[PDB]
Design an enzyme around this catalytic site. Structure first.
Site, short mmCIF file in Angstrom:
data_model
loop_
_atom_site.label_atom_id
_atom_site.label_comp_id
_atom_site.label_asym_id
_atom_site.label_seq_id
_atom_site.Cartn_x
_atom_site.Cartn_y
_atom_site.Cartn_z
N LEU D 38 -1.12 -32.61 -23.08
CA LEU D 38 -1.21 -31.76 -21.90
C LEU D 38 -0.10 -32.14 -20.93
O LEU D 38 0.42 -33.26 -20.97
CB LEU D 38 -2.57 -31.89 -21.21
CG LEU D 38 -3.80 -31.84 -22.12
CD1 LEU D 38 -5.05 -32.17 -21.33
CD2 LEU D 38 -3.93 -30.48 -22.76
N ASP D 39 0.26 -31.20 -20.06
CA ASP D 39 1.28 -31.46 -19.06
C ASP D 39 0.61 -31.93 -17.76
O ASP D 39 -0.60 -32.15 -17.71
CB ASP D 39 2.17 -30.23 -18.87
CG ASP D 39 1.58 -29.20 -17.92
OD1 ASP D 39 0.35 -29.13 -17.77
OD2 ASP D 39 2.37 -28.44 -17.32
N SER D 40 1.41 -32.08 -16.70
CA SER D 40 0.88 -32.61 -15.44
C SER D 40 -0.17 -31.69 -14.84
O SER D 40 -1.20 -32.15 -14.33
CB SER D 40 2.02 -32.83 -14.46
OG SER D 40 3.12 -33.47 -15.08
N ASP D 42 -2.21 -29.56 -16.25
CA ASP D 42 -3.50 -29.70 -16.93
C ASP D 42 -4.20 -30.98 -16.51
O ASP D 42 -5.43 -31.00 -16.39
CB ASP D 42 -3.31 -29.67 -18.45
CG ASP D 42 -2.42 -28.53 -18.90
OD1 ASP D 42 -2.63 -27.39 -18.45
OD2 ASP D 42 -1.51 -28.78 -19.72
#
Lengths: 69, 56, 49, 82, 97, 72, 97, 77, 77, 95, 192
Positions: D38-40, D42
């Site tokens: 996941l990215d930041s 998320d």
């Protein structure tokens, strides 16, 4: 017992600066305006209003207006 | 990164313009209705008995 | 009763009975007073009629 | 106070209830960017969901610091209002 | 009766605030609530007497501030309006207690 | 708390539950009954009712200043 | 030591007092000032008695208090005409003869 | 464990009055030097003020002028 | 003025302690109504005949005033 | 109702204090706010003043509209006249 | 004043019961869907809110409606101003009271699951005052109408004085048109 407050140097400096404000007066424009407005003009207006109240009482009573300094 | 920083600043300004006047705050959270209502006693506090006496 | 993973207990019997009965008393009072003083409030006829 | 096992289970439920997350590969010691991908944004969405479930408010700095499951469980277990 | 109406909350408040260490969390609550409840009962009796009896009660204890004609006093005027406010205040106070 | 147990306050303090709170409350009830007697007697002495009530009222048992006042 | 606890004053202006030159005799000046004070206090107490009977008229008479206590209202308002020492702020319509 | 039935936990109010350490059991605290003169003068103040003010004749100018005004009103009426 | 003679007199209006604002031509009907209200603790279902009569008299007075003002307006136009 | 969290350590000054720190209504908590707080931080003081002046001007305009209406000029009933010289003696007139 | 004391104390006590049960939430944005879990408390809130609006023949119907009628019948600039603002305030009061009722009890749940699990309705000493206040908010307005606000009542004796030229109660009662009598109800339902 050992109840003395843990003195903070900056708090003590703030207190001393607050109680030694007399050294920082310089008769600047703001100080001159404040002295001339709230130290002269406002007391003069209050005195004139009080004398006016007394004179209005004299006029309503029909007496001769009183003499004040 | 420079235009990224300007985008961040513009977004922050836009958020500050359109933020809720009274955003929801958890009651015990800083700024809530229950904040510092009945706090637990601070640690390291001592009560001294027989403070002022004529003789020690 | 539980539906996914959360169970909610039924409200107490005296709570439900008291609330329902007091609201029923309110509604019956409103209905009875409306029947008694309906035309008077609505201007159909004066109280001395 | 709320048990650490229940904290772990609820945090794992929050993480597993995610679109871009494979529920099989969720463990109390996974990292959002590394393991389950996941990215930041998320991460901060998951932190907000954890707040909403647990009835607690995190300062923004600590919310950014929460970047993995283990951190989430550690913070929630250390918080006394969980 | 009427000074009892006025001063019953004061007596309970003073005793619970000067000896609250002995009454406790439950004893002080019981005492204040029963004082306010008796004040409310006496207020209802006063309502009967004054408003429903078409009477009026007047009281005076001490001059308080006494000057040439500054006619202050520790009086109590019990009219229908005063009694209605008495009921409202005392009943709400007991329920709130 | 930890240090609140060493602080004496007139109104109990945090979570004041004395062992004999029931006996203390009974004594407080008796004290209220005792202090209300002089107040009640002073009330009955100082009350003035210039108007005779339409109905018999409880105050007619002890108060006697009923219709005894005139503005002359 | 005092004989008994009731005030003994004379209801007459002190003699050897000259209104033209009140400051010639200091004793006469001071006794005249005391007598004037006593007379003003007597007038104040008379006004207070009228006020008390007026208030009891207003209490005894109910809705019809405007006509039953009109004479007492007029009597009190004329009696309070010259009560004060320094009440010059009071309007002459109520404080001047 | 109802709050209205179970007895309270604490046997004594928390702390001590005036933050005074209690004396050992079977002993009485030693009074301060000022305590006796202060209590005697307080009791003397109370008794002197009460007895003198209540026994003082009501010879005030207000009551004297009230009596004189009543006499004058009775004479006029 | 009005088209109704004032039946109640000043003496009986004062004796009955009728409120000042309601010392109009319907006071003679208000006097029994107030006595009934005092006797029945001002209950809103006890004094019905007297209340209806007093309200009818007041309505008649208000209708008289409305007719007078309508006549005035017609004369003005 | 019920015990809460500890307030936490307050702010020990480490830099020279402003000459108006008394205008900082600081509790024993690490979250102090000035004794005078603006409830609506989003709007400026002059913008809030303008909005309040607009509201008061709306009130004044509604009052002016009420004056222009002249409702007293459209009263539907003549003034009530009481018997016995409009209750002169009862109200306090000279008998 | 008496009627407002009654039903406003009722509203405050019920809201305090809701807040106490919801772990001191106090915010309506996180209070939805409590009608099922708070039967007695919601019933009390509904009774008090309807009284405050002035639902017909409750304790607020016998107080505010007469105030509006008198404001209309006071043919003066101040009377017109008061009538306009009173009607609009009735509309707004209905709106916000029904909005509070919906948000607190009938809107689908918006609160956190932590508070929903541990929510308990008002205990006996928080319910006895509520029942008495509900009975008052039902019958005080009807019982005291002829006692206080009646036509030419000597109940007040000399406590309240009104000049003969300033009494317009009968004028309002027998002059106010039916539409102006029914304005508060229409505004209340429009606000709801």
């Amino acid at each position: 017992g050992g109840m003395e407050a843990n003195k903070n140097k900056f708090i003590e400096d703030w207190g001393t600066a607050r109680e030694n404000l007399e050294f920082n007066f310089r008769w600047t424009r703001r100080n001159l305006a404040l002295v001339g407005i709230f130290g002269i003009a406002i007391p003069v207006l209050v005195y004139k209003g009080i004398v006016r109240e007394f004179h209005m009482q004299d006029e309503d009573n029909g007496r001769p207006y009183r003499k004040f300094m | 990164p420079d235009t990224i920083d300007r985008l961040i600043a513009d977004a922050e300004a836009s958020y500050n313009k359109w933020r809720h006047p009274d955003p929801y705050i958890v009651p015990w959270a800083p700024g809530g209705s229950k904040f510092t209502r009945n706090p637990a006693p601070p640690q390291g506090i001592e009560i001294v008995y027989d403070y002022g006496r004529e003789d020690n | 009763t539980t539906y996914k993973g959360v169970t909610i207990h039924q409200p107490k019997r005296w709570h439900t009975i008291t609330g329902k009965g007091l609201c029923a008393v309110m509604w019956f009072w409103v209905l009875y007073r409306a029947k008694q003083d309906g035309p008077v409030v609505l201007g159909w006829r004066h109280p001395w009629e | 106070h709320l048990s650490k096992e229940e904290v772990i289970q609820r945090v794992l439920a929050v993480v597993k209830d995610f679109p871009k997350v494979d529920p099989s590969k969720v463990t109390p010691d996974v990292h959002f960017q590394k393991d389950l991908g996941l990215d930041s944004l998320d991460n901060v969405e998951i932190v907000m969901a954890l707040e909403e479930e647990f009835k607690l408010e995190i300062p923004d700095k600590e919310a950014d610091k929460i970047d993995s499951c283990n951190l989430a469980i550690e913070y929630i277990a250390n918080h006394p209002m969980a | 009766m009427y000074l009892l109406i006025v001063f019953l909350p004061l007596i309970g408040s003073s005793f619970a605030g000067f000896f609250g260490r002995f009454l406790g969390s439950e004893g002080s609550a019981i005492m204040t609530t029963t004082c306010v409840s008796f004040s409310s009962i006496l207020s209802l009796i006063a309502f009967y007497e004054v408003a429903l009896g078409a009477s009026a009660c007047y009281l005076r204890i001490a001059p308080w501030i006494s000057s040439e004609m500054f006619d202050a006093s520790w009086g109590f005027l019990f009219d229908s309006l005063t009694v209605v406010m008495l009921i409202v205040v005392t009943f709400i106070s007991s329920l709130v207690h | 708390g930890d240090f609140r147990t060493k602080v004496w306050s007139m109104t109990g303090g945090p979570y004041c539950r004395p062992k004999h709170w029931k006996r203390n409350t009974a004594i407080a009830m008796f004290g209220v009954v005792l202090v209300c007697i002089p107040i009640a007697m002073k009330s009955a002495e100082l009350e003035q009712r210039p108007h005779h009530p339409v109905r018999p009222i409880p105050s007619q048992l002890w108060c006697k200043n009923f219709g005894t006042k005139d503005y002359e | 030591g005092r004989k008994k606890g009731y005030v003994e004053f004379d209801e007459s202006p002190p003699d050897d007092f000259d209104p033209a030159n009140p400051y010639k005799d200091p004793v006469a000046m001071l006794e005249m000032r005391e007598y004037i004070v006593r007379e003003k206090w007597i007038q104040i107490e008379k006004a207070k008695i009228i006020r008390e009977k007026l208030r009891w008229c207003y209490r005894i008479e109910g809705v019809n208090h405007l006509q039953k206590c009109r004479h007492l209202v007029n009597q009190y308002l004329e009696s309070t005409r010259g009560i004060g020492w320094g009440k010059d702020g009071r309007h002459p319509s109520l404080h001047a003869p | 464990p109802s709050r209205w039935t179970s007895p309270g936990h604490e046997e004594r109010p928390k702390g001590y009055l005036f933050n005074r350490t209690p004396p050992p059991p079977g002993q009485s605290r030693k009074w301060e030097d000022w305590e006796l003169p202060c209590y005697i003068t307080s009791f003397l103040t109370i008794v002197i003020l009460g007895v003198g003010l209540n026994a003082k004749p009501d010879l005030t100018i207000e009551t004297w002028a009230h009596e004189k005004a009543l006499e004058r009103l009775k004479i006029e009426n | 003025g009005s088209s109704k003679k004032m039946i109640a007199t000043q003496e009986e209006m004062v004796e009955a302690r009728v409120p000042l604002a309601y010392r109009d031509q319907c006071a003679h009907l208000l006097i029994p109504l107030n006595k009934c209200r005092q006797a029945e603790f001002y209950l809103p279902w006890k004094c019905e005949n007297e209340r209806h009569s007093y309200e009818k008299c007041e309505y008649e007075l208000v209708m008289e005033r409305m007719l007078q003002m309508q006549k005035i307006r017609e004369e003005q136009k | 109702s019920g015990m809460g969290l500890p307030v936490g350590k307050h702010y020990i000054p480490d830099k020279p204090l402003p000459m108006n720190e008394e205008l900082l209504w600081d509790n024993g908590t690490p979250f102090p706010e000035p004794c005078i707080d603006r409830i609506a931080d989003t709007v400026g003081k002059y913008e809030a003043l303008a909005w309040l002046c607009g509201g008061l001007s709306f009130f004044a305009s509604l009052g002016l509209l009420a004056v222009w209406n002249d409702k007293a000029s459209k009263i539907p009933f003549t003034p009530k006249v009481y018997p016995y010289d409009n209750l002169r003696v009862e109200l306090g007139g000279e008998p | 004043l008496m009627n407002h004391a009654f039903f406003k104390a009722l509203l405050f006590l019920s809201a305090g019961s809701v807040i106490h049960a919801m772990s001191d939430e106090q915010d309506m944005r996180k209070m939805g869907g409590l009608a099922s879990s708070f039967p007695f408390t919601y019933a009390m809130m509904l009774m008090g809110s309807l009284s405050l609006i002035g639902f017909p023949f409750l304790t607020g119907f016998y107080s505010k409606d007469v105030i509006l009628e008198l404001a209309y019948t006071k043919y003066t600039i101040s009377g017109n101003f008061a009538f306009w603002l009173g009607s609009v305030s009735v509309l707004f009061t209905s709106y916000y009271s029904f909005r509070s009722l919906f948000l607190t009890f009938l809107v689908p749940t918006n609160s956190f699951g932590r508070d929903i699990l541990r929510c308990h309705d008002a205990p006996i000493p928080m319910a006895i005052p509520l029942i008495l206040l509900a009975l008052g908010s039902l019958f005080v307005g009807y019982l005291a109408k002829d006692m206080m606000i009646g036509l030419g009542t000597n109940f007040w004796a000399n406590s309240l004085f009104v000049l003969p030229k300033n009494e317009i109660l009968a004028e309002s009662e027998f002059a106010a048109p039916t539409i102006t009598k029914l304005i508060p109800i229409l505004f209340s339902t429009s606000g709801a």
